[PDB]
């Protein structure tokens, strides 16, 4: 790959510079290069990988939603025919988004997940796998939509099982996994009751464990707990 000639440490350094510069495509390319060196990632490095690709796919997802809404309106009664352009451009953005998701899933499969033994790494990567299958599911409409959804569910479920056995209820990775799996239930799997139940149980079990934490850990956990609460308020 184009990062093959750059030192691992230099790729990490440049990923951090790219973040400061809000150059998220560069950040993601540097982190992909770092992963492709073949060594496991540290906690900080995993976080950089996640931030870089989330910012990239987030721009694509926002654009896709804008274009899909225009396309949906164009297909309403009384809307004037304007040609193939809206569909074409929505498809262009869609294909690019799918390519980014496939790239992330490919890094996870070759070979981050299989070498991840500690709960903090394995849950993190399995959550990411769920997230990027979820983004694929958001745009899927063909014979494989059900399989894409089930791939997201399967990754999230394995992550959930490990997190419940190996992490405290306030662990931020555990909390963020639960938050995102709950969003999956609500928005992808047509299971709002499961989404609400998961968010509630997660929030309550975290509340009960806050007393064990330092001030800094408390701040980290309560931040994500507030996101759970925000979704519960939206959904109920």
């Amino acid at each position: 790959g184009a990062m093959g000639s750059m030192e691992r440490a230099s790729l990490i350094q440049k990923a951090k510079l790219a973040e400061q510069a809000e150059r998220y495509e560069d950040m993601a390319a540097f982190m992909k290069g770092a992963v492709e060196k073949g060594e496991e990632l540290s906690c900080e490095e995993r976080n950089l990988l996640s931030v870089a690709y989330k910012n990239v796919v987030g721009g694509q997802r926002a654009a896709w939603r804008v274009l899909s809404s225009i396309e949906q309106k164009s297909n309403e009664e009384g809307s004037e025919e304007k040609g193939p352009e809206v569909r074409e451009y929505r498809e262009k953005v869609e294909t690019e988004l799918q390519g980014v998701c496939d790239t992330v899933l490919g890094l996870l499969d070759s070979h981050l997940i299989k070498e991840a033994g500690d709960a903090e790494s394995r849950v993190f990567y399995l959550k990411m796998k769920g997230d990027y299958y979820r983004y694929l599911a958001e745009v899927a409409t063909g014979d494989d939509k059900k399989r894409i959804i089930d791939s997201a569910r399967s990754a999230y479920q394995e992550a959930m099982d490990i997190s419940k056995k190996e992490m405290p209820p306030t662990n931020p990775i555990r909390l963020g996994l639960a938050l995102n799996f709950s969003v999956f239930h609500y928005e992808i799997a047509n299971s709002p009751e499961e989404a609400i139940s998961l968010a509630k149980t997660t929030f309550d079990e975290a509340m009960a464990d806050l007393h064990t934490l330092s001030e800094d850990s408390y701040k980290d956990s309560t931040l994500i707990m507030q996101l759970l609460r925000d979704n519960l308020t939206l959904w109920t």
Binding site: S50, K54, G176, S182, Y186, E187, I224, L227, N231
Partner: peptide
Amino acid sequence: SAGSIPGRR
């Protein structure tokens, strides 16, 4: 619509 984590910056 719903909040997930990480989010966009």
